[PDB]
Amino acid sequence: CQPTRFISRHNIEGIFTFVDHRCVATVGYQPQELLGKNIVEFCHPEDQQLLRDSFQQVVKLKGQVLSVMFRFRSKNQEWLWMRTSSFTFQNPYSDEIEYIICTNTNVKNSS
Amino acid sequence: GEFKGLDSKTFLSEHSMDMKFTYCDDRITELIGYHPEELLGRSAYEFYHALDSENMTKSHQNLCTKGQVVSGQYRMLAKHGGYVWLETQGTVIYNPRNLQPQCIMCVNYVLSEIEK
Numbered sequence: 204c205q206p207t208r209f210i211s212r213h214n215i216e217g218i219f220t221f222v223d224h225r226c227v228a229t230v231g232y233q234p235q236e237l238l239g240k241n242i243v244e245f246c247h248p249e250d251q252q253l254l255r256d257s258f259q260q261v262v263k264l265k266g267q268v269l270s271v272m273f274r275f276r277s278k279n280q281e282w283l284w285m286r287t288s289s290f291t292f293q294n295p296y297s298d299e300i301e302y303i304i305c306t307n308t309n310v311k312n313s314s
Numbered sequence: 315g316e317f318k319g320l321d322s323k324t325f326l327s328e329h330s331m332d333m334k335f336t337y338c339d340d341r342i343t344e345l346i347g348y349h350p351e352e353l354l355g356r357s358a359y360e361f362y363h364a365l366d367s368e369n370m371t372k373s374h375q376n377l378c379t380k381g382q383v384v385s386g387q388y389r390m391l392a393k394h395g396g397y398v399w400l401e402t403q404g405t406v407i408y409n410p411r412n413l414q415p416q417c418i419m420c421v422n423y424v425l426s427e428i429e430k
């Protein structure tokens with residue numbers, strides 16, 4: 204059984220700038236409902252600093268992967284466990300600001 | 315090759331560990347002609363130019379060892395004939411719980427128009 208997951212692109216501030224349509228099955232939102240919003244706006248209060256810290260660290264990692272598990276508010280207003288693995292990309296031929304690529308998978312909080 | 319404006323010629327893709335597409339950005343259709351759903355489950359070897367298959371096999375082995383690396387330049391056969399040059403930044407995504415690889419995430423940037 205394949206995991207349920209979707210890809211997103213963010214600016215370094217955390218704003219969704221691209222969302223793969225697999226997001227509908229994963230978290231219930233249409234891509235247009237996520238675009239332009241910060242990922243932290245969907246984050247459980249206990250996990251908000253964690254997620255900010257994660258996005259800060261990923262920029263410092265200059266392309267290496269960081270992964271974080273946190274609670275994401277679904278379209279049905281339920282807390283879903285998400286594991287986000289992220290890394291930055293920058294076009295090597297220019298000096299465009301880097302952006303962040305995330306793969307976001309619904310996972311279990313279970314031992 | 316054209317190295318200006320590459321952001322407008324960049325598309326994302328996701329792959330299994332055995333070189334199959336599991337996701338592709340719709341941007342590929344305007345650039346190379348394929349629809350994402352027709353790539354799913356299909357092998358990269360159905361699309362690599364014959365001159366590049368070998369190097370891309372070695373490059374994939376390099377990726378799996380380093381966890382992330384750039385591919386080197388290669389050619390993808392285009393849907394309606396000919397090819398485009400491109401290069402890929404690949405990144406292996408691991409399950410943190412057991413460090414097994416789950417998939418490969420790619421940032422692909424197209425370096426030419428369709429050529430014969």
Ligand SMILES: Brc1cccc([C@@H]2C[C@H](c3cccc(Br)c3)n3nnnc3N2)c1
Nearest residue numbers: 329333358361373374377383384385404
């Ligand atoms: Br053709 C083609 C067009 C876009 C992306 C791909 C990727 C390329 C990507 C890959 C291969 C070798 C090195 C690197 Br870095 C990335 N990969 N890994 N597993 N399957 C694939 N297919 C192939």
